[model samples]
Target: AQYEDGKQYTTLEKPVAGAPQVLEFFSFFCPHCYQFEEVLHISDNVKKKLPEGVKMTKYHVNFMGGDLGKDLTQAWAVAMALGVEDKVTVPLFEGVQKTQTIRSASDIRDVFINAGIKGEEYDAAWNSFVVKSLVAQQEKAAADVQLRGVPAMFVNGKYQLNPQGMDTSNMDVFVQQYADTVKYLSEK
Candidate 1:
């Protein structure tokens, strides 16, 4: 019923320090994060297990986006501003990963348009202080983590999920372990 320090999770040496919450760092270009969104449902599944008031926040990691790194991070913040993140997530993944057509910030605009966001609204949010702030946080954290890979998760902004000794053989066990470990960390 207990998780070990290195076996189950990691306590960061240079923690970002935040209120108790689940912060997931991922890149839209990452196939693993794409699969994580398409199937695993780990974020939602783990959220349900957390105590009330503990929330999950997802940040777009810029390292995997090549030239369009900050733009894609800006795009994600725009999606959050428009309140159509669920609608844009899959299409962005499909566009960049599957179709390979989202090469520019303008192409990323098409993604929002397809998701029912108007050009004016998208532009406004694109230049808004909140969206700008969101992108800034993502850009900074992406570097702060010194991340080796995408889909890195942290509970309360410090304790990261370590992939050691996790029972990944079965889907049920995998989900169960994530929920339990995250729940434990939420309290930590």
Candidate 2:
């Protein structure tokens, strides 16, 4: 299927300045988001193919409306604040999806512990004002985007890439298509 602008993707009214912003809205409890990790190898793909001057960010969604979503969202914000998002991303996802071990704050904290985050650093980040502020910012961003689901990608804050009707079942095709879309928007 041919993915056209405005239909397949939306153009934002106010785009972020400087480089294009590539944002992924996700939730830890989302199985499809987990599949996105396995199928698309999202982090690796972004690190490898995302062009210079483009900024990639992941926003935690709290639309699930439960303690699990809220806690995990806070945990992710803490991880980002501590600059350990790269270290904790997969393990946190696997802890929830594969091992079925993370069900509470302590369980999530343990994932970071195993990823080399120390007790002091973990405590600081979890309690930091910056983390709280970031969590609020992310929550607002989700609302601002009118985010409908997990594993959704937004380019330059305006254009949202619609995976529906796209050949995303094939991992290679999906990744390439997503990368191409970001590249196209980044140059616009």
For lDDT, the strongest prediction is: 1
* lDDT (0 to 1) per candidate: 0.83, 0.78
Instruction: List pairs with backbone clashes in candidate 1.
Output: none
Model 1, stretches more than 4 Å misplaced? Answer: none
What TM-score does candidate 1 get on C-alpha atoms?
0.90
Clashes counted in candidate 1 amount to 0
By TM-score, the best candidate is 1
The residue pairs found clashing in candidate 2 are: 10-159, 12-158
TM-score of each: 0.90, 0.89
> Model 2 over residues 131-175: C-alpha lDDT tens digits?
999899888787667777788887776787766645657788877
- In angstroms, the error of model 2 at 87 is 1.1
